[PDB]
Amino acid sequence: KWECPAGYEVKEGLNVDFPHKGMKRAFIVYPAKNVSGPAPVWVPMTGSVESTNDNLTVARSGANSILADHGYTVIAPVRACANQDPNIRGERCNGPGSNGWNWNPWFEGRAADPSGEHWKNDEGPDSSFFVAMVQCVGTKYKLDARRLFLGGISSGGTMTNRALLFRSNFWAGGLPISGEWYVTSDDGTPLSFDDARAAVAAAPTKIHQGRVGPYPLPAKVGPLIVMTVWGGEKDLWNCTRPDGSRFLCADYRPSTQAGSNFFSAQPDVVHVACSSTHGHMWPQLNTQEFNRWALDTLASHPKGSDPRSFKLTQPPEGYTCHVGPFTGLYASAWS
Numbered sequence: 001k002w003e004c005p006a007g008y009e010v011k012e013g014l015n016v017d018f019p020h021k022g023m024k025r026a027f028i029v030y031p032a033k034n035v036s037g038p039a040p041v042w043v044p045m046t047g048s049v050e051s052t053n054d055n056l057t058v059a060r061s062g063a064n065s066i067l068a069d070h071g072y073t074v075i076a077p078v079r080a081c082a083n084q085d086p087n088i089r090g091e092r093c094n095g096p097g098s099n100g101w102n103w104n105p106w107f108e109g110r111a112a113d114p115s116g117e118h119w120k121n122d123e124g125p126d127s128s129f130f131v132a133m134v135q136c137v138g139t140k141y142k143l144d145a146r147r148l149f150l151g152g153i154s155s156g157g158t159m160t161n162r163a164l165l166f167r168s169n170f171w172a173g174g175l176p177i178s179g180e181w182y183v184t185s186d187d188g189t190p191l192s193f194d195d196a197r198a199a200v201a202a203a204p205t206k207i208h209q210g211r212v213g214p215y216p217l218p219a220k221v222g223p224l225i226v227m228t229v230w231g232g233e234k235d236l237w238n239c240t241r242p243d244g245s246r247f248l249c250a251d252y253r254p255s256t257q258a259g260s261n262f263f264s265a266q267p268d269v270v271h272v273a274c275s276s277t278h279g280h281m282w283p284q285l286n287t288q289e290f291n292r293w294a295l296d297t298l299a300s301h302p303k304g305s306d307p308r309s310f311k312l313t314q315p316p317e318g319y320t321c322h323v324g325p326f327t328g329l330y331a332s333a334w335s
Helices: 052-057 064-068 114-120 125-137 155-166 193-202 252-265 287-299
Strands: 013-020 023-030 039-045 073-077 143-153 173-177 224-230 236-240 246-251 269-275 320-323
Touching: 013 125, 023 052, 023 064, 023 125, 039 052, 039 064, 039 125, 039 155, 039 287, 052 064, 052 073, 064 073, 064 287, 073 125, 125 143, 125 155, 143 155, 143 287, 155 173, 155 224, 155 252, 173 287, 193 246, 193 252, 224 252, 224 287, 246 252, 252 269
Parallel strands: 039 073, 039 143, 143 173, 173 224, 224 269
Antiparallel strands: 013 023, 023 073, 236 246, 269 320
16 A cells, blocks of 8 residues: 555655646655654644745744654645745635635635535545555655544644545544634535534534535544644634735634534544644644644554543643543533
């Protein structure tokens, strides 16, 4: 299952012109340190505005590349809209998607109009690119097939949710940090930002369909561990209109709740709901302790492990986590 497009030579560092579905893609590889044998894999994804390079090396953005020093082979995809440039920030990426896609940074959700119909049933080019990427790197570095994890922030977090829903038989788990769910009605009807938000508030513990994934969502997914993170009361995102003004267009309380609801109900999935107070950005409090804790937590549940034997350890100061759905975002019915 390890293979590269014929003639592709994978290398440490930046890899460009990787052929996938008629596209030329790029990604950066940081081989694990202090490891004998197959290494667990971390696939970090930036959001709408930070570059992949920022995500990988700027402290306040997560400095994800450092996990290679923590013993993970890090394989970082560059967003399609960045045209293979790991330094592109919001240029041509931070805005509405095209061709049926809701948001441009990653092919992470179907658009609200009929042009998104097709993606109800098709993973999209990022989800499949990520699998081929990891399969290709593994012909050159020893990767632990039971510990392929991906994760990201904001749009990268929405892409993580999507990837998990369409490829739950590949990834061992993931870390969607303030990712959307794009809640829709049970019949798949896209809902406005306001209605999507009201729909979860009216039924905070139910399973909500969403444009982030297959429609209808899958009845059963492969074995996984998923850790969804909510950045508290200010974890919200305001879009920027062409005239440069801003308006609220995403609230992560309902989307983190909705994902925790779907994943917690799955029998072969361990779901950890984590809350912090840093807002909408990469976890800011004790950032590296958090990255280390989060990934080693994911790694403690190799693919196919029994959810009953999972044991959560305490997170760094500034984080509240527990197994199961979020319970602190909305009042319980028992009032």
